[PDB]
Amino acid sequence: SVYDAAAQLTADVKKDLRDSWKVIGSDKKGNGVALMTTLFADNQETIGYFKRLGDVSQGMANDKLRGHSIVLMYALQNFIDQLDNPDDLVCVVEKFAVNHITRKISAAEFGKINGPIKKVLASKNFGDKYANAWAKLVAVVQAAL
């Protein structure tokens, strides 16, 4: 359940999430677009969900993809800001989940973002330790799907 998954975010996971977000979140447009292009590159099959974005290969030059990528990074910002209060993190994760559930994005499909996150982390010198902390955060959303 999302309440149990939220409890897996221990003191050090929360700290590692904040320390990496300090760097990754500093450029929301650049890192969000990079995150989305790595998803489409590594997992071609997910492009079908993003039919409305159009020609995804354009990356930064595609205004709709760029709009989506910036908005996606503010959802992550929101999750990092709610780490102090589990009750607030959960109601925000469940609110967030509504539109993904409507789109029939399963917990296994959502989990495809973990590879993109690990790769963007690694480009900014945050290795496995931080990739694993971000996968526990993604798991709280997966439990709500």
What span, in angstroms and rounded, lies between the C-alpha atoms of 145 and 113? Answer: 14
Nearest to 131 by CA among 143, 113, 110: 113
Among 42, 54, 57, 74, binds its own copies (CB under 8 A): 74
Does 98 help bind its own copies (rule: CB under 8 A)? yes
Told to check if 75 binds its own copies by CB under 8 A, we report yes
Among 71, 106, 122, 129, binds its own copies (CB under 8 A): 71
- Indicate which single residue of 10, 15, 27, 29 sits in contact with its own copies (rule: CB under 8 A): 29
Q: Of 84, 82, 71, 69, nearest to 141 (Cα)?
A: 82
Question: At its nearest, how many Å lie between ligand HEM and the CB of residue 140?
Answer: 10
Minimal distance, residue 113 CB to ligand HEM, in Å: 4
How far is 94 from 60, CA to CA, in rounded Å? 30
Residue set of the binding site: 100
58 binds, among its own copies, ligand HEM, none (CB under 5 to 8 A by kind): none
Nearer to its own copies, 81 or 109 (CB): 81
- Rounded CA separation 58/50 (Å): 14
- Cβ distance 17 to 133 under 8 Å? yes
Distance CA 42, CA 138 (A): 18
Per CB under 8 A, residues contacting its own copies are 28-29, 52, 63-64, 66-68, 70-71, 74-75, 77-78, 81-82, 87-88, 90-92, 94-96, 98-99
